Amino acid sequence: SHMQVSIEFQNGEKLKFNVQPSHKILDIKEMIFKKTNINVKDQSLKFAGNEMINQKTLSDYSIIDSTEEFTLHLETKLDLM
């Protein structure tokens, strides 16, 4: 089976993405970029009221090893320009 994460938008709709224990939070920005075309420099993601770091892995945050699945939030007023 493939394992997945959800991304919640400012319009209140969602996307879904395939992941593996190797991926960094910057690779999540890259997969979003390959869908939405919003440049990774401009976009950022949140969970439980904190902003996630581009240097870290899904495993350092416990995102696939926790007791629950994930939806990550897109930050306020993000757009192509």
**Paired tokens of 66:** 């926790």
In the chain, count of helices (H) and strands (E)? 1, 5
Of 55, 30, 60, nearest in space to 42 by CA: 30
Distances (CA, A) of 71 to 8, 27, 47, 81: 7, 16, 8, 25
Q: What are phi and psi of 8, to 5 degrees?
A: -100, 125
- Residues with Cβ within 8 Å of 18's Cβ and at least 6 positions away in sequence, in order, are 2, 3, 4
Domain that holds residue 53: 1-81
How many structural domains are present in the chain?
Answer: 1
Experimental method: NMR
